[PDB]
Each structure stands twice: as C-alpha cells, then as structure tokens.
C-alpha cells in the first residue's frame, strides 16, 4: 500500500521529503496518462466554510478529472451550518458518515486537524486553515519548480513581497528546506519581513539566506522568483504608496534574468506584477495555477487508493 494511503494531508511539516517526491512523481504521471475513472463511485465533500473560489474550482475539477462525485458548500455567506450551536466536531462526525474524503477550508487555524479527530477513517485534506497551512498550494508550487527547473535542490529562490503574513511563502520555505543546497533571497518591506522562526529554522539547518532591498540586486542569480501580494489593509494608504510600493515587477526588470528563471505568484495578483510581464517566457503564474490540477489529483489518488498502478 503506498505511504499516503488514507492519511490526512493537514500540514506540510508532516510530509517528509519522500512523501513530497512520491506526490510529485504521481502528478507527473497523471499529467502524462489520465486516469479519469480511478475514483469512480467515490463521493467527496468539498466544505469551504470560508469561501475561496480559485481553490474550490480547482479542487473540484481535479475530483471530476479522476471520476469522483462531489457534494458540498461554499459559505462565509450564512448557508445554515453553525446555526443553533452545532460544534465543528459534530458537523464532521455527521459528514464523515457518508462521504469518502473531506476537503475543507476554514477561518480558524487548527480546524482541519481537529476534523481529523472526528472523521473516523475518512481522510481530511486541508485547503487552508486561517493563517496556518495550505499543503495543496505548496504541493503545486513545488511541482511547478520541479517541472520547470528539473530539480528541487540547489535552487536560488527569491521571495518577494509580504513575507510576514504570506501563509504560502512560509510553507514553501519550510518545504524547500527539506531539500539540499537551496539559497534564499528575501526582498520585503521592513514591516513585512520574514519572521524569525523561519529564519531560525533556516540557520539551524545550515541553509543560506540573505535580505535585499531590490530585485535587481539579485535577478542575475535567480531561478524561481516567487512574488506575493501586499494586502494594502496591512499598511496604511500612504505607507503602501510611499517608497515601499516597489516590490513590483515590470518586464524591463527581467533584462538579465537567466533563461530558466520563472516568476510564480499564488494569485490574485493585483498590481505587483505588471501586465507586460505576461508576454515574457518567464511568466509562469497561470501555468502554475494549471499545475494545481495535477498536484491535487495526485493527493486524492494516493489517499483513496491502496496500490496505485500506473
């Protein structure tokens, strides 16, 4: 039986390097020969207690491309659950009574892991729990670095933007640290700096990182440039606009990028990457979003299947 068979994919810190490579080699196969009836007759719940369209449409299309049925709700817009005083432990003890896996997003951190205590042995795959984790966004990012760069070690990866609150830059830094010889460049305004616990974990593993104030200091050396959106609510109108709005990429900045350099962005991009970057061969944010189909398909295949023959 494969190691992920019937496991819960709650956190990236729980997946080993080997776990990461198994998912990523399976995504590569399903991208190459489809298996559109592997999950035939499986019914899966797509519970998004917090709405997230991008993520839901992708998760469900991946479920549809392997043949599974989907039931569920998008909410944050009062669709009857939580009324009276139904606890989440009780909602999950009733939903796992008839579905084969629960994909769930929720506003509080820890909610997917508590679902795990109540689901019996229906697996729980986490699609975001507050500011804690989002495994399936790190899995697709990793798959896109792997697929375009050919490797996940010896990378020079730059992380640009709000590094203090960006839930995905924090997990991708944790996963790339599972691998060897990667080098990090963090470029963030001072108020949005990469927290100590990341930095401390990097230092303790002997991994090299450095902070820079502009992208042009490091463009030449870089392989993956992972951009984040600054949320203007996190600053005041004037701070955002003042000098700090220069974590924005334009096509002209790519002048001297290596032929292999790729720009990734979990999205929505609002203005940190200008529209003219799209026509460059380095723009890979949308092809990154398309790769979420195969990484989410691979996890569902590996978790619901004992033995996966390919």
């Amino acid at each position: 039986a494969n190691p992920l068979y019937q496991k819960h994919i709650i956190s990236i810190n729980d997946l080993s390097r080997d776990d990461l490579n198994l998912v990523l080699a399976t995504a590569a196969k399903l991208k190459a020969n489809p298996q559109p009836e592997l999950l035939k007759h499986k019914v899966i719940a797509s519970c998004f207690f917090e709405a997230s369209t991008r993520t839901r449409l992708s998760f469900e299309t991946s479920m549809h491309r392997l043949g599974a049925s989907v039931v569920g709700f998008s909410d944050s817009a009062n669709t009857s659950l939580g009324k009276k005083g139904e606890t989440l432990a009780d909602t999950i003890s009733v939903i796992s009574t008839y579905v084969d896996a629960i994909v769930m997003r929720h506003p509080q951190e820890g909610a997917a892991r508590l679902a795990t205590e109540f689901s019996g042995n229906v697996p729980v795959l986490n699609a975001g729990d507050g500011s804690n984790q989002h495994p399936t966004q790190t899995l697709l990012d990793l798959f896109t670095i792997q697929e375009t760069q050919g490797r996940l070690d010896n990378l020079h990866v730059a992380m640009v933007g709000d590094l203090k609150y960006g839930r995905t830059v924090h997990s991708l830094t944790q996963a790339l640290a599972k691998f060897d010889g990667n080098r990090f460049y963090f470029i963030a305004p001072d108020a949005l700096a990469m927290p100590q616990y990341i930095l401390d974990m990097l230092d303790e593993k002997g991994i090299a990182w450095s902070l820079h104030s502009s992208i042009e200091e490091v463009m030449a050396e870089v392989d993956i440039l992972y951009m984040t959106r600054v949320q203007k609510e996190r600053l005041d109108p004037s701070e955002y606009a003042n000098v700090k709005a220069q974590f924005v990429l334009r096509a002209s900045d790519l002048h001297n990028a290596k032929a292999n350099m790729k720009v990734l962005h979990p999205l929505p991009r609002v203005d940190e990457i200008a529209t003219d970057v799209d026509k460059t061969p380095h723009a890979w944010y949308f092809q990154q979003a398309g790769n979420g189909i195969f990484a989410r398909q691979a996890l569902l295949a590996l978790v619901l299947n004992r033995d996966l023959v390919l």
Partner: protein, 153 residues
Amino acid sequence: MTHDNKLQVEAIKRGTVIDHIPAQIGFKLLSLFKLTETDQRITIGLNLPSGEMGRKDLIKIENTFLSEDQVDQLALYAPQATVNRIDNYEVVGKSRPSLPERIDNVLVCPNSNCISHAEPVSSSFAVRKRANDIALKCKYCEKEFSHNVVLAN
C-alpha cells in the same frame, strides 16, 4: 524532635508526598491536575515554614501512586518538587520532575483564532527547551509561544 519541623506527624503508610512545592503552586496543582477527585485521605499544608527554602507547600495523598508522566507534568509549575512514594511507612523512591514531551489538557492556546477555544478538544502542546526558555507549540494552530505567554494566557 522540636525545632518544630513536623509536630505529631502525618506520616502515612502508603502514598505519594509531593514536597517542596514552591509556595502558591500548591493550590494550582490541585486545581489543574484535579488531585482532590478522590475519596482517599489527602492532607495539604500551605505556606509551610521551611526556613531552608523559605516557605513551601506540600500535598500528602494516601494509597495513591501518581507517576512517571504524571510527575513530569508538574515540571512546568513546580520545577523542583520531590515526589516521594511510600509503601509501608517510609520513602521507597524520591522522584524529581523532568520536563515532558507534551503537556496535554492543562494549558490554553494564546491564539484567539485557534479552534481549540470553541471545541470539545483537550489542549496539547509540544515542549521544546529552547535553551534559555521553553517554547510550546500548539497541536492545532501550530503556533509556537514562550511558555510564559502561555502560563499567563
């Protein structure tokens, strides 16, 4: 005999005596670890003179052998407490608290968005002596806090 020490001693036959409880942790320990939910004889002494460590507290619990894990738990509160078992009228093992792997139940996540607040869940933290302090990581939100942020709240 007298340089007062004991006076007419509560010398129990079989039990646990938790001695050197740092003063004021004595009551915490009974509450938190729900030690009075028993029908056996307990005798507690609060704010004892113990000129030798100023003042301290002390719980005597009969025919009870609270141990190993149960003892290590107290490490966060009374770091130096010597638990003593007694089998027939004398000390048959003094045991010191060691800091444990996990602290379950008794502790609260600082994180107000942590789901453990509204749910039928028992709290659980992973302990890491980050040499200087002890950091505590929540099982659920996976946020890491100084043990002093958690022990205030």
